[PDB]
Design a protein around this ligand. Structure first.
Ligand SMILES: NC(=O)c1ccc[n+]([C@@H]2O[C@H](COP(=O)([O-])OP(=O)(O)OC[C@H]3O[C@@H](n4cnc5c(N)ncnc54)[C@H](OP(=O)(O)O)[C@@H]3O)[C@@H](O)[C@H]2O)c1
Ligand SMILES: NC(=O)c1ccc[n+]([C@@H]2O[C@H](COP(=O)([O-])OP(=O)(O)OC[C@H]3O[C@@H](n4cnc5c(N)ncnc54)[C@H](OP(=O)(O)O)[C@@H]3O)[C@@H](O)[C@H]2O)c1
Ligand SMILES: COc1cc(Cc2cnc(N)nc2N)cc(OC)c1OC
Ligand SMILES: COc1cc(Cc2cnc(N)nc2N)cc(OC)c1OC
Lengths: 246, 246
């Protein structure tokens, strides 16, 4: 029943985006995370130290493919999120697909407690979206006037974000090709709400010890089956995987 | 820089053990763990629910190849460890390699607080080893007289286990082909002490939510680079990976 995987194909830079194409239509929520062999999402508080050149390339590619990059406010602070950068070629490829030159950032926050002074607001070509709750969207909107478009993402409960609404709120604005880069709380919610369509997961060839949290924190305990779409590798032993529900 | 992995080879039951051969000589500490996509070592408190037929086959194969299966006392209680089972063919293959018919169990405990009444002692063809500290080995030996061989595995500190000594204590008894199936505390220590030579890691195609701990718990924060030896897959989307230091 066991098949050996090995490298069968060098991926030209035209095929690589094909591997990670979004659906032709409909909203697609893709997560991109990196994890150590032993399930560690962080080394020294962030994921950067595991992100080798291979993973950075895939990471930037996924951003390049996305209409919007949805990120929890914690990751935004902790990983020092600034505006998405798109090089001339990235922009070109994006226009070629009928996309804006750079994807937007969508910051998710139930609290609304974002400061006017954050790199996501400051070092950014496009103003980011703030995805938050009906309860606090208005004050958040005013407090962040000029910096971000604040979007109420409550479903039935005006005090929380309904992650399915979040997704539709983005799609409603033509940001249907969604990428989230976390964090683990945010990813946890996408998981619980069963709105995660896709997990792109870099498995870094490291063990990091027990201190690190996983790429998904929270109280959720689901058992969402996903399908292995592909696994890529490089010379450094990284596995760049792509899993799709269900 | 990116190569697509795909199934290039169906593994006959003779090749599969070759993929997981132990070195011809020297002690080798191999860990076998299963993890969800999102780094969850457990579903509902144990790893069983992620272990499909593919993973059970590999798991039993690794046991089959091992001279001894080293397991922390917590995993022994929590996963209801009983004696290792070896079928007639498993035994045959083991004898063919000059190995005993079934590998031994080695239970690791710093405390020594094992009960005479445990399935590891009761439903077992071979009495298991108890790998513990110099400080408590004697009382442990007496309290477990008839049930287990108690082995002092302290290095410089008689109050703790030195995991390198643990490994040598097993090798000294001709149990040099070591497999550990955890748990995460135990694996954490193997990692910190840098004695883990190999991680066989099943990546189950599931996301499980944030509740689960990783396959490595503890305060350790290392960055041990490992080399991807192989990745196998089955029809169910499982990745059966084998990583080797360094
Ligand atoms: N290995 C990787 O791939 C990876 C990727 C990203 C991050 N990380 C790491 O994980 C760590 C941070 O974890 P984190 O959980 O705090 O990140 P996070 O999910 O980005 O931040 C959590 C916060 O974002 C908001 N949020 C998340 N989900 C929400 C939801 N469904 N509805 C409303 N708000 C939501 C909340 O903000 P409010 O409190 O304002 O309501 C929440 O407190 C960092 O160290 C980071 O480096 C790792
Ligand atoms: N996904 C997987 O592959 C996998 C595999 C195995 C287990 N698990 C799960 O993880 C959970 C249990 O975790 P756990 O950390 O408690 O398991 P564990 O490592 O087997 O048990 C911990 C205990 O074993 C002893 N121990 C471990 N390392 C030691 C060392 N270096 N020196 C001396 N003693 C040591 C200690 O016993 P004393 O307290 O007596 O000193 C320690 O308290 C279970 O739910 C289990 O299902 C998952
Ligand atoms: C590619 O650059 C970085 C990317 C990330 C996050 C991240 C990195 N890799 C993957 N596969 N998923 C992610 N969500 C984190 C970083 O450090 C915080 C980075 O800087 C090196
Ligand atoms: C194969 O049978 C089981 C194995 C395990 C532990 C385990 C399972 N799979 C892997 N890859 N590593 C491990 N350490 C755990 C189990 O449940 C506790 C099992 O029963 C189904």
């Amino acid at each position: 029943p066991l098949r050996l995987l090995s490298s069968v194909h060098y991926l030209t830079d035209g095929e690589l985006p094909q591997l990670y194409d979004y659906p032709d239509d409909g909203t697609w929520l893709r997560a991109n995370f990196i994890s150590s062999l032993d399930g560690g999402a962080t080394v020294d508080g962030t994921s950067g130290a595991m992100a080798g050149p291979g993973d950075r390339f895939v990471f930037n590619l996924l951003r390049e493919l996305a209409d919007v990059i949805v990120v929890g406010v914690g990751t935004v602070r902790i990983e020092g999120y600034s505006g998405v950068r798109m090089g001339v070629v990235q922009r070109q490829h994006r226009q070629a697909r009928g996309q804006s030159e750079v994807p937007q950032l969508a910051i998710v926050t139930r609290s609304g407690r974002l400061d006017r002074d954050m790199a996501v607001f400051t070092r950014t070509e496009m103003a980011p979206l703030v995805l938050t709750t009906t309860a606090v969207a208005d004050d958040t909107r005013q407090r962040l006037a000029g910096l971000a478009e604040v979007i109420a993402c409550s479903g039935d409960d005006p005090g929380t974000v309904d992650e399915a609404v979040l997704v539709s709120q983005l799609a409603a604005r033509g940001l249907r090709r969604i990428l989230t880069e976390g964090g683990p709380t945010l990813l946890g919610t996408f998981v619980e709400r069963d709105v995660l369509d896709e997990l792109c997961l870099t498995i870094a060839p490291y063990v990091v010890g027990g201190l690190a949290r996983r790429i998904v924190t929270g109280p959720g305990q689901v058992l969402t089956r996903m399908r292995c779409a592909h696994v890529l590798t490089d010379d450094s032993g990284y596995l760049y995987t792509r899993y799709v529900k269900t």
